[PDB]
């Protein structure tokens with residue numbers, strides 16, 4: 103694409119995109135063009151507005167584009183072309199990416215006892231409501247736990263809410279604890295955009 | 304994919320998909336799986352139901368899957384696996400495609416005079432509310448008008464409603480009428496799915 | 508999108524797109540922009556050319572854009588902006604859709620006998636090498652056979668060639684022949700972008 | 709989808725996916741299914757093999773699925789279902805994501821003088837050949853530089869190679885240096901995956 107300013111916009115929150123080089127108030131020779139999940143290629147939006155788009159994105163008196171509540175389908179490219187009073191043309195190019203922050207990750211099915219030297223299901227962690235999906239990771243006593251390295255295995259599941267499109271992640275951790283290891287370890291789960299079992303030697 | 308029955312479902316209308324080989328009423332060992340625009344890969348739906356999916360797709364007492372009002376995001380694949388009382392397993396595989404019928408095509412601008420032997424903007428036709436987009440075609444006196452053949456030019460535009468996702472099509476027709484041709488032709492516009500005629504005077 | 512000329516281009520064949528209003532030979536103030544399966548949003552192509560794109564799409568001496576062999580990934584939007592010697596700017600907007608014609612449909616597993624009043628597997632039809640997929644339909648004595656109407660059922664399968672992306676369609680027809688019907692019917696299969704069994708009364 | 713093991717596979721490199729619970733050598737009752745950028749929904753692959761898929765993915769004597777050189781189109785879901793000699797069925801579910809590591813980021817244009825208290829183009833950084841695209845970040849004296857915070861502005865561009873599909877990123881950094889700040893700062897550019905520093909003189 104072209105050189106653009108990258109914008110991250112939280113779903114459900116308003117977004118104001120500035121049309122650089124536009125006169126401060128009408129009359130303004132400016133045009134907004136957008137290509138998002140809502141459009142077939144480019145859609146042109148004007149200061150006059152009108153129609154269904156007025157519910158989604160409106161040009162403000164200062165020529166900025168206003169979205170009252172951003173959604174997943176507003177991901178895409180937004181462009182303004184304006185002429186000032188001198189006659190100089192100025193372009194504004196935005197690449198808009200949307201996100202949502204999930205609830206705190208929760209442990210839903212933890213083991214109270216592990217046996218050293220064999221594989222053990224440690225627990226299951228769930229994170230609800232992210233966008234984009236993100237990932238869950240496990241930690242042992244503050245250090246990251248790396249799957250497929252050192253008797254650690256992890257299985258993961260992603261589901262989508264059928265109306266909001268937000269993701270739920272579920273992650274299952276299995277470990278083979280090392281002989282003569284910590285008898286009261288602490289496992290934790292974190293989301294990237296406290297399980298304390300007894301270990302039996 | 305696998306061999307499936309193709310289903311075309313009108314947006315906004317209910318859809319019932321049969322689970323073949325399931326007992327006529329509970330208890331039933333059956334499971335529905337769907338992969339649509341609503342899902343991340345396969346989603347499993349059970350006779351027990353529950354949760355947000357109950358607003359979208361529910362298993363009925365006879366084991367059929369019911370969607371009260373189909374939407375664009377319900378396009379995809381739907382599968383049932385059931386065991387009868389004997390123990391025979393039966394699979395049902397559906398490929399669901401959704402559609403919407405637009406309003407009647409309308410001419411929104413039209414020429415009242417054409418000049419033979421030069422290019423003329425004849426008119427503009429608009430169709431609102433289709434899914435998938437579909438296409439607009441022009442006709443001259445009942446015969447199809449073919450772009451790039453015989454001095455015919457067409458330009459077309461597709462727009463999407465920002466909330467419903469339904470398509471609006473706009474088509475502009477230009478023609479170079481042939482000398483000594485019909486002085487009162489009839490141009491019409493028609494819509495063809497994706498799975499007031501114009502009567503100007505021509506000046507020789 | 509904008510008002511454009513719709514172009515259908517056969518896969519594997521060249522495509523020439525005219526830049527309207529460009530001078531007949533260099534020097535020309537023109538620019539091509541394309542958004543296809545090959546691009547991240549718009550890509551700009553110039554008369555100077557250069558780089559990997561020279562293998563895919565090149566601006567010709569008359570300012571037209573030339574693709575030596577169109578592929579599936581060249582589906583999208585193509586635009587030219589040119590200035591003539593007077594200084595008038597002219598835009599050319601193309602919407603390019605690609606296709607491939609499959610081989611003739613073939614019957615691969617036909618019944619020689621049907622029994623009236625019960626369901627019968629009549630046969631299987633296969634079409635290889637289309638793009639986009641297209642559909643197969645069945646006909647009885649020249650009239651279309653409509654699934655789910657009048658004891659007709661059809662199952663369909665679509666597969667994609669793992670390297671070319673072209674589609675293979677397979678279609679299975681079952682019918683319940685009507686009592687006192689034609690004892691030597693003719694079923695045929697057609698592709699949209701001769702099975703002659705004996706029927707036992 | 710279902711619970712799966714997530715696999716990250718480097719483009720161009722082989723990939724072996726194990727079919728858990730299969731007999732160690734033929735005869736084996738096992739079946740692989742994959743849904744990737746190469747397939748229309750599920751494709752079934754068998755120990756017998758054959759056809760164009762033999763160039764892309766093959767079942768090995770131990771029942772593992774082998775891809776000699778992974779590509780972007782092999783992203784997707786891979787599943788094995790096998791029966792052992794007892795008759796126990798075991799499923800293997802893999803979610804495969806592909807990646808490519810770009811070349812080292814390079815500064816392609818850079819300022820040799822900045823003026824404190826006004827905006828300055830500092831430089832342009834380029835990274836070629838990543839998949840997925842990834843992002844470029846700027847740093848000042850080892851600390852991350854945050855766009856829109858403290859007179860910092862960044863513009864970025866992503867392009868795709870027309871044949872390989874790998875991404876090239878270009879990032880332009882502008883800063884307004886603070887009065888009485890460091891007169892010999894060090895700006896650097898770094899690449900972060902998607903799953904020669906600049907040392908100008910500053911004029912107060």
Ligand SMILES: Oc1cccc(Oc2ccccc2)c1
Pocket residue numbers: 130131132133183184185191
């Ligand atoms: O002449 C006009 C009058 C009104 C609006 C307008 O929109 C643009 C402004 C600047 C650049 C491009 C387009 C141009």
Ligand SMILES: Oc1cccc(Oc2ccccc2)c1
Pocket residue numbers: 331332333334384385386392
């Ligand atoms: O034993 C059960 C219990 C509940 C549901 C179920 O659903 C299936 C039926 C047949 C095949 C696969 C799945 C099977």
Ligand SMILES: Oc1cccc(Oc2ccccc2)c1
Pocket residue numbers: 357358359361369371
């Ligand atoms: O309008 C709706 C909305 C959701 C589900 C629904 O389907 C049932 C209704 C009653 C009982 C059983 C199924 C109908």
Ligand SMILES: Oc1cccc(Oc2ccccc2)c1
Pocket residue numbers: 535536537538588589590596
């Ligand atoms: O001034 C120039 C010089 C060279 C090429 C050029 O490319 C365009 C031509 C017309 C319109 C827009 C862009 C513009």
Ligand SMILES: Oc1cccc(Oc2ccccc2)c1
Pocket residue numbers: 736737738739789790791797
């Ligand atoms: O009987 C067979 C013969 C060949 C392959 C096969 O593959 C599966 C094994 C277990 C479960 C599902 C499929 C099963």
Ligand SMILES: Oc1cccc(Oc2ccccc2)c1
Pocket residue numbers: 762763764766774776
């Ligand atoms: O380079 C390749 C290309 C295709 C398949 C392949 O995998 C096998 C090779 C030999 C024997 C068995 C499997 C290796």
Ligand SMILES: [Cl-]
Pocket residue numbers: 260261262341342343344345346709
């Ligand atoms: Cl899901």
Ligand SMILES: [Cl-]
Pocket residue numbers: 140141142143144145461462463508
């Ligand atoms: Cl649109």
Ligand SMILES: [Cl-]
Pocket residue numbers: 304665666667746747748749750751
């Ligand atoms: Cl396939």
Ligand SMILES: [Cl-]
Pocket residue numbers: 103545546547548549550866867868
């Ligand atoms: Cl690009």
